[PDB]
Ligand binder design. Structure first.
Ligand code: UDP
Ligand code: UDP
Lengths: 286, 290
């Protein structure tokens, strides 16, 4: 009944797949000379990083051209476990030597653009306990097969969370209502074209996902964004103080894209907030 | 900046209010106190809340009203049996058609009360305590310059909307107000001077709108907070919390001039305040300006 509703319905019809059952073989055949890089950001994920790598490794040399763990300064056994599991481990410093690192996830994903060569870049979190081998095929399907798509968001069915449903989706309803069609805007499993990703700033820390979604929308609208169901995953039960820090940075990043000033004041406890994006990687490479 | 917050907590926050009913009665100095419970279909709890306040009626408390918001259950009869006067939205402000939501109820109660101080207490509380009203009025009666008192609950050793939505948004847009522990709480008291003169946000936005307007107009030191006791976080469905969050966002955006689309969640979202009650009840308001 609203303009938002109407666009959502058609966008789901065209750009959302609850059964993204493309085969690896057909996706390989559709690459048409494009290459695919998979990047796992990792900070102290020794218990899970190898398991994630193991689910992607069978695609290496076929659908996937490179599988990189972009280490974020781990002090546990993340790097060596990623090595043994069959990934290429690259530090923030090796990825982009000319810029000093700053903390947070967004920095890692941004730097990975300088360390990878794929025409399509896929991000998968390294803290996943139950990774499924079809994540990468499902994420790249719309990029390889669907005209005009530059960003694919992977969502999970449940057997979003609190920040998604209380913070991100309500703020998008207020500020960019067409984007409320995206089921899991904060999700860490997603893929984009190099053309898109090199051309947008990267928000810091836990702002990176929402920043990329809004910057893509502001340039290209809903037509360029797709989503795919990766399967069933249970909600993680994270501490409220962590969720609040995430909510504060999601707010800061949304406000920075939507014309709202932000005090720069992090959370008052009885938190880390940065409004400093990294510039488009095109300004340094390519 | 934490110096501003530290000083406010030192002077304007009470974890253990010491006040007795007798000392508060003795401090009224001719001021009267109205207690208003908004109620929409609260038959299971409204009587218990009223019962905790009724012993104060005729002493500390001058009026005890349940503002019924269109209930179809036994809310009215049970509130009356417990000793409250029950006033419908229509009776409170008869010439203005009612609109839905909590903010409407609190706003209308201003036309149906005579107190120099108005105390709001939710009627859905499972474990009300008789010292709520004394604690909420203490800073209004015994401190100087306080106009709004927010009652907070200590938690066993705010909720999800408070900590993920309200506090982070205040950090971004009204940073001093992050010192308020439970900005969305429904137990609070205000002066007639303040409440009659501010617009009232609709629905679930009413509390945050009043907090921000008080802050802007009267300042941080006009706001106080008091610990009402230990209460466990209420476990509500996420969809309900999301609808509340969306309205909190809308009201804070209204108070900051952020274009809000008005688009709800696939939920009710209003961007329209009710005007200050002194615009519709000017003679009542003037009679109470004292
Ligand atoms: O500074 C950071 C923060 C996070 N991450 C990675 O980004 C993903 C999401 O991080 P989050 O903090 O949400 O999860 P957690 O680190 O608690 O598992 C995980 O794979 C982290 O290892 C990272 O590489 N650098
Ligand atoms: O339109 C409304 C919505 C709420 N309330 C009252 O305001 C308080 C807070 O409402 P909430 O919806 O949080 O509680 P619930 O109505 O779910 O018990 C309660 O005493 C409600 O009865 C009201 O009078 N009118």
């Amino acid at each position: 009944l609203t303009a938002t509703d109407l666009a959502r319905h058609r966008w789901l019809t065209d750009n959302s797949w609850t059964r993204p059952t493309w085969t690896v073989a057909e996706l390989e055949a559709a690459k048409a000379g494009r290459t695919i890089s998979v990047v796992l950001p990792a900070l102290n994920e020794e218990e899970t990083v190898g398991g994630v790598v193991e689910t992607i490794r069978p695609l290496l040399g076929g659908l996937v051209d490179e599988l990189i763990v972009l280490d974020s300064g781990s002090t546990d056994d993340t790097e060596i476990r990623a090595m043994a599991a069959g990934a290429r481990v690259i530090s923030r410093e090796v990825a982009l030597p000319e810029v000093a690192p700053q903390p947070g996830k967004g920095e890692v994903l941004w730097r990975s653009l300088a360390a990878t060569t794929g025409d399509i870049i896929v991000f998968i979190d390294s803290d996943l306990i139950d990774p499924d081998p079809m994540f990468v095929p499902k994420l790249v399907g719309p990029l390889l097969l669907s005209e005009g798509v530059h960003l694919v968001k992977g969502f999970y069915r449940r057997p979003g969370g609190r920040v998604t449903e209380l913070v991100a989706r309500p703020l998008l309803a207020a500020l960019r209502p067409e984007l409320t069609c995206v089921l899991q805007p904060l999700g860490g499993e997603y893929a984009g074209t190099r053309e898109l990703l090199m051309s947008v700033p990267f928000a810091p820390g836990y702002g990176v996902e929402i920043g990329l979604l809004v910057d893509t929308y502001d340039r290209l609208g809903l037509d360029a964004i797709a989503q795919v169901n990766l399967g069933v995953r249970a909600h993680r039960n994270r501490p409220l103080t962590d969720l609040a820090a995430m909510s504060r940075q999601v707010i800061a990043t949304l406000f920075s894209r939507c014309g709202v000033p932000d005090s720069g004041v992090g959370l008052t406890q009885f938190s880390e907030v940065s409004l400093v994006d990294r510039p488009p990687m095109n300004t340094l490479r390519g």
